[PDB]
Amino acid sequence: AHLKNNQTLANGATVTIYPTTTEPTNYVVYLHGGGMIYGTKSDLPEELKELFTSNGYTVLALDYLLAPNTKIDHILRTLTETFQLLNEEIIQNQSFGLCGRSAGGYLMLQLTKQLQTLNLTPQFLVNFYGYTDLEFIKEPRKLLKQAISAKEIAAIDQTKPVWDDPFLSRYLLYHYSIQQALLPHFYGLPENGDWSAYALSDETLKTFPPCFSTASSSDEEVPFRYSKKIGRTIPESTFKAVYYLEHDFLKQTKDPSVITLFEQLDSWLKER
C-alpha cells in the first residue's frame, strides 16, 4: 500500500517511507539536519517531500546516530551499514539519489564516497547548505546570543546510542557545545587538529554524480563557499545561491526566495 510508513532495519535504524503514486519507482534517501548532535528524519519539509514524490521519487527519510553519544567516525560507518540494509530491503539496486540538509549534506557526501567502493553510486545528489570537511568548526561562531547554562542541558543523555530526536530536545546540547568550544570533543575529532580523514578532496568530489547545491550568502553557521564548491567542483552540477536568509532556510518554505529555489530544484530534478 502507498501510504507513508516507518520501517525498522536490522541494525535498529528506522526509515520513514513516502511512496509515489506509481510502480516501478525511483528513490531518494533524505538525511536530516541538526549538526550530528540533534534532530530527526521528521524535519523533512512537506514541500521538499512533494518535490521528490511528484517527480517519481519515493522518499526514504533515514535515521543516523548522534554525537556525542556516538562519534563521527562511528556515525559514518553505521550510515554505510544502514544504507546497505536499506538497499537490501527497499531500494533493491534500483536508481536512487541522495538529499542532505546541513549536517545531512556532509553525511550524504561522505556516504557517497563510501558507496562508490561498494558499486552503489547515487544517480544524483541534492545539497542544502552542507559541507565537505569540518575545518569551519574551528572558527568562532555566535549563533545563539544568550549563554546556555550547564543546568539547561544536564537532563540530556550523552551515554546511550540515539537514532532519532523527534522533538529537537538535544538542540541546546548542540549550541552549548559550540559556545563551550566542545564540538570537536563531542564529535571525537583528533585533538591535534589534523582532521584530514574527515575531509573530502577536490579529487574525490570530481568523481561524484551530479549535484544540485544551494546555500544562503548570509549563512553564519556554515560558510557558503562549501556549497559553491559542492555545486561547482562536482561535474555537471548546479549551485544556486539564496540571499539574506539564515542558515537553515528549509524552515521557511513559504519565503519567496525559497519558493523560487524550489522551482529551480524542480526543473533540475526533471532533467535527471
Cβ count near 193 (within 10 Å) = 10
The experimental method, as deposited, was X-ray
> Dihedral sign, CA of 133, 137, 139, 144?
positive
Number of structural domains the chain divides into: 1
Mark residue 137 as left, alpha or beta (left: phi above 0; alpha: psi -120 to 50; beta: remaining): alpha
> Is residue 169 within 8 Å of 156, Cβ to Cβ?
yes
Q: Which domain holds residue 110?
A: 1-272
CA distances from 270 to 138, 200, 260 (A): 39, 28, 16
CA distance 227 to 233: 10
Task: Starting at the earlier edge strand, list the strands of the sheet with 238-242.
Answer: 5-8, 14-18, 57-62, 26-31, 96-101, 125-128, 211-216, 238-242
- Resolution for this experimental structure (Å): 1.6
Take residue 79 and report the three cell numbers written for it: 550510515
CATH number of the structural domain spanning residue 17: 3.40.50.1820
